[PDB]
């Protein structure tokens, strides 16, 4: 896993962030099984519970461009530091990625499975 | 101004992408963007139901990932090619990014999103 | 319908919002079909779209409490101000009032389903 | 300090009010405040499958309009009463609620929800 590179893209990803209401940007980065790498970014709503995350973005992503498995994740801020999903994209993530699913942390990537035990499902 | 055929065909096409394994009620949409571009989703399930994501959803994120802009028309099918109108939670999603004059395919006759959602909260 | 009554318990209700991140809070209040008055306030996430709305919290309390069918409902902001349900909420009441539920509303009351003409469902 | 017998027995009851007609799988959950008092939920489902609220989420909407305050202990449970891990956005929003320390009953030893979610987005 080039996570130098997911990182990059995830960042990139960042500067379409749709955040009028906290400003706080939010990209991610995923490789798929197929090698090829799908993006997203936050968009919220004036209703905040209606705000898609990052990596619900991804997922759409992983979806619309033919489907597969996640086999890594970075998700960064607008100013590239890394991190760490929400439950709920810790859920929506096991869905498409398993407990296997590398995500991104400064200090070293974790499984999904460990960030995510005892999962619902 | 809006290619109705075209929208509609893109979602049709959009809905074979559809992760819906607890329904197995594909949905697929497609959106025409303010500078041109044509953008599309499918909805994806979750097995914790409430976490599913609607494939006009799946647009707006697929807008803001691919240079962002405003929503002019849109177009919402099932995996039939059925024309569906947005759920309640698309029509406040969708009006942020196409507001009250947003066009949504209809069998009949495209409707303004400001008619489908009156009297938006805002 | 008491419409002062259900604007009123709306009112108490928004003293209870849990809303650190705006600070807007909601309150909202419903009539169901045994006559009994449900409430429910909104509850912020520091995740944004995992926002709960007042509405949402009434649909819980009515289910809580003995199920049945919602007549009529008020939701106002923190000043006692009339407030729209998001299309969210609008999708979720139509659940469990149906088109011919009453949505307060600062001139007259309205019909859900005028509210949310030719619903998905 | 937390009699779970009490909370496991109470989410039991409160799952027979879940609205679940398109999986017929109800969820029931209690939680002890940090006054002493008991708040319970049932699952909600929608025909919109993304707009079910979950009955965790329920919980914390009673919580609210009930003096507010913190969750101690959460016990959640299905129709038959087995004992369930909340979903990832339960986690969440329990965590906003009750903190790390916050106990999720187990059928072999309750758990912190901070081991149920590491490294928490906050
Ligand atoms: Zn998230
Ligand atoms: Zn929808
Ligand atoms: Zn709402
Ligand atoms: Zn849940």
Partial sequence: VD???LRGNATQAAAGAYVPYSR???????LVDDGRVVTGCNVQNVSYGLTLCA???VVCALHSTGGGRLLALACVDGHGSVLMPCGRCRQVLLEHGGSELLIDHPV?????????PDAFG
Same sequence: chains 1, 3.
Avoid at 24 to 30: L, R, T
Avoid at 108 to 116: E, W
Wanted: glycine content about 10%; overall charge positive; hydrophobic content about 55%.
């Fill in 55 to 57: 990596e619900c973005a």
């Fill in 3 to 5: 996570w130098n590179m």
């Fill in 108 to 116: 070293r990537p974790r499984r999904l499975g460990d960030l995510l």
């Fill in 24 to 30: 706080f940007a939010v990209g991610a980065a995923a």
